[PDB]
Design an enzyme around this catalytic site. Structure first.
Site, PDB file in Angstrom:
ATOM      1  N   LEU A  64       0.810  -1.213   0.000  1.00  0.00           N
ATOM      2  CA  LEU A  64       0.000   0.000   0.000  1.00  0.00           C
ATOM      3  C   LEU A  64       0.846   1.268   0.000  1.00  0.00           C
ATOM      4  O   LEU A  64       0.337   2.340  -0.351  1.00  0.00           O
ATOM      5  CB  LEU A  64      -0.930   0.019   1.228  1.00  0.00           C
ATOM      6  N   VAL A  85       4.148  -0.233   3.971  1.00  0.00           N
ATOM      7  CA  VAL A  85       2.881  -0.648   4.556  1.00  0.00           C
ATOM      8  C   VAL A  85       2.233  -1.644   3.617  1.00  0.00           C
ATOM      9  O   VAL A  85       2.129  -1.387   2.415  1.00  0.00           O
ATOM     10  CB  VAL A  85       1.956   0.550   4.828  1.00  0.00           C
ATOM     11  N   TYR A 140      -7.001  -1.712   9.054  1.00  0.00           N
ATOM     12  CA  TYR A 140      -6.951  -1.292   7.657  1.00  0.00           C
ATOM     13  C   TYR A 140      -8.159  -0.429   7.354  1.00  0.00           C
ATOM     14  O   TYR A 140      -9.290  -0.841   7.596  1.00  0.00           O
ATOM     15  CB  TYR A 140      -6.931  -2.517   6.735  1.00  0.00           C
ATOM     16  N   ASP A 157       3.539  15.475  12.406  1.00  0.00           N
ATOM     17  CA  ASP A 157       3.508  15.123  10.990  1.00  0.00           C
ATOM     18  C   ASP A 157       2.116  15.299  10.392  1.00  0.00           C
ATOM     19  O   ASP A 157       1.700  14.532   9.516  1.00  0.00           O
ATOM     20  CB  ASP A 157       4.027  13.705  10.748  1.00  0.00           C
ATOM     21  N   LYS A 186      -0.560  16.227   7.957  1.00  0.00           N
ATOM     22  CA  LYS A 186      -0.679  16.489   6.528  1.00  0.00           C
ATOM     23  C   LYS A 186      -1.742  15.538   5.981  1.00  0.00           C
ATOM     24  O   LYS A 186      -2.022  14.521   6.604  1.00  0.00           O
ATOM     25  CB  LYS A 186       0.664  16.288   5.803  1.00  0.00           C
ATOM     26  N   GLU A 190      -1.845  13.331   3.710  1.00  0.00           N
ATOM     27  CA  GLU A 190      -1.380  11.968   3.464  1.00  0.00           C
ATOM     28  C   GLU A 190      -1.476  11.068   4.682  1.00  0.00           C
ATOM     29  O   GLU A 190      -1.539   9.842   4.521  1.00  0.00           O
ATOM     30  CB  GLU A 190       0.085  11.980   2.988  1.00  0.00           C
ATOM     31  N   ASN A 191      -1.499  11.634   5.884  1.00  0.00           N
ATOM     32  CA  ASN A 191      -1.518  10.849   7.106  1.00  0.00           C
ATOM     33  C   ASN A 191      -2.909  10.695   7.696  1.00  0.00           C
ATOM     34  O   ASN A 191      -3.054  10.134   8.791  1.00  0.00           O
ATOM     35  CB  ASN A 191      -0.557  11.449   8.124  1.00  0.00           C
ATOM     36  N   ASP A 233       0.307   7.075  11.061  1.00  0.00           N
ATOM     37  CA  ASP A 233       1.721   7.385  10.959  1.00  0.00           C
ATOM     38  C   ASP A 233       2.138   8.235  12.133  1.00  0.00           C
ATOM     39  O   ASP A 233       2.018   9.461  12.128  1.00  0.00           O
ATOM     40  CB  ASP A 233       2.121   8.008   9.627  1.00  0.00           C
ATOM     41  N   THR A 266       7.355  17.490   7.397  1.00  0.00           N
ATOM     42  CA  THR A 266       7.296  17.676   5.959  1.00  0.00           C
ATOM     43  C   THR A 266       7.455  19.166   5.650  1.00  0.00           C
ATOM     44  O   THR A 266       6.799  19.982   6.307  1.00  0.00           O
ATOM     45  CB  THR A 266       5.919  17.178   5.457  1.00  0.00           C
TER      46      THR A 266
END
Length: 340
Positions: free
Chosen positions: A39, A47, A112, A156, A158, A160-161, A174, A191
């Site tokens: 993933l 992951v 998941y 962190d 953002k 994406e997390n 994350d 980031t």
């Protein structure tokens, strides 16, 4: 704060500290799972979607190569990540179900979330309306209220997390940079687009960096692009430290006002870091429509539910080269990872 909130956070801290002081270890093993699909991948880990062979449940397994963690000087961060994740409990934090290690790797097996990352949905849709951005932002505000009360900095934030779950709510994933800190900490991490000025300038910084990052996130959600961007990190950092930000004309006045107070370069004046703490954010007019309790209880209907066919669907994740999960015949880096 209402005594109801104070008592909630006191119990949250009690429960966190018990798990923090006696962490779980070694609660599954690799051959309990079938590998399904990669993933995501990074410089020291990956992951993978896995399926437990006895229960049939799907999980997201983060695999870290111990030798690369050492080389890339991430030992303490990896120990932080697992010790924090096994101790926390909040509706918008991903659940760690198992962890273990072997001769080569460290493993964290989490729930998941098939809906995928917020970043993909944001880039697909373009930008989120203010109500939609506000729904997500409220969850982050409550999540940071929880984490910060445990002396945890996340470091962190953002899109994406932030995974979008089957009810359309956020799961923060994350914790690779999360840390228990009383007072200040110094590590350069994050980031670039999301770094607070005091990180860029190499200061001793505190939880105010997470509130800065919330400003960046809200801006990016509502605009479709972050407030400080450029081809090279140094050019991003120059913009961040300048104290200037430009807002799209479609932003509401209330949104602009909140963002000026989150994206405040002087950390001693930044919302979330004042005497009234999180309440300066929760009571801001941009959040006037937010029912904080209903968000916590997951009673608000979400802006959208990701499309997916079932708990094993990987359509909302992208495709990566499938590489071996190799386990050496000899133990690597045993001493460094004893506590994992």
């Amino acid at each position: 704060e209402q005594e109801s909130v104070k008592e909630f956070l006191a119990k949250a801290k009690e429960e966190f500290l018990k798990k923090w002081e006696s962490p779980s270890q070694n609660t599954a093993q690799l051959d309990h799972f079938d590998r399904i699909k990669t993933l995501g991948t990074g410089s020291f880990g990956r992951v993978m979607l896995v399926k437990h062979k006895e229960t049939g449940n799907h999980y997201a397994m983060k695999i870290l190569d111990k030798q690369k963690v050492v080389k890339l000087k991430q030992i303490e961060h990896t120990l932080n990540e697992k010790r924090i994740l096994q101790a926390v409990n909040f509706p918008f934090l991903v659940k760690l179900e198992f962890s273990f290690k072997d001769n080569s790797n460290l493993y964290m097996v989490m729930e998941y979330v098939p809906g995928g990352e917020m970043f993909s949905h944001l880039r697909r849709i373009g930008r989120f309306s203010e109500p939609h951005a506000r729904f997500y932002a409220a969850q982050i505000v409550l999540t940071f209220e929880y984490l910060h009360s445990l002396d945890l900095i996340y470091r962190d934030l953002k899109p994406e997390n932030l995974l979008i779950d089957q009810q359309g709510y956020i799961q923060v994933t994350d914790f690779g940079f999360a840390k228990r800190v009383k007072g200040r900490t110094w590590t350069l991490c994050g980031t670039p687009e999301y770094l607070a000025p005091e990180i860029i300038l190499s200061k001793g910084y505190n939880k105010a960096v997470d509130w800065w990052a919330l400003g960046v996130l809200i801006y990016e959600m509502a605009a479709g692009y972050p407030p400080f961007f450029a081809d090279q990190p140094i050019q991003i950092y120059e913009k961040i430290v300048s104290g200037k930000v430009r807002f799209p004309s479609h932003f509401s006045s209330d949104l602009k006002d909140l963002l000026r107070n989150l994206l405040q370069v002087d950390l001693t004046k930044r919302f979330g870091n004042l005497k009234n703490g999180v309440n300066d954010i929760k009571n801001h007019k941009w959040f006037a429509t937010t029912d904080w309790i209903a968000i916590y209880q997951r009673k608000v209907e979400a802006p959208f539910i990701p499309k997916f066919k079932g708990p094993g669907d990987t359509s909302n994740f992208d495709d990566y080269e499938e590489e071996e999960i190799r386990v050496s015949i000899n133990e690597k880096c045993g001493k460094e990872f004893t506590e994992f």
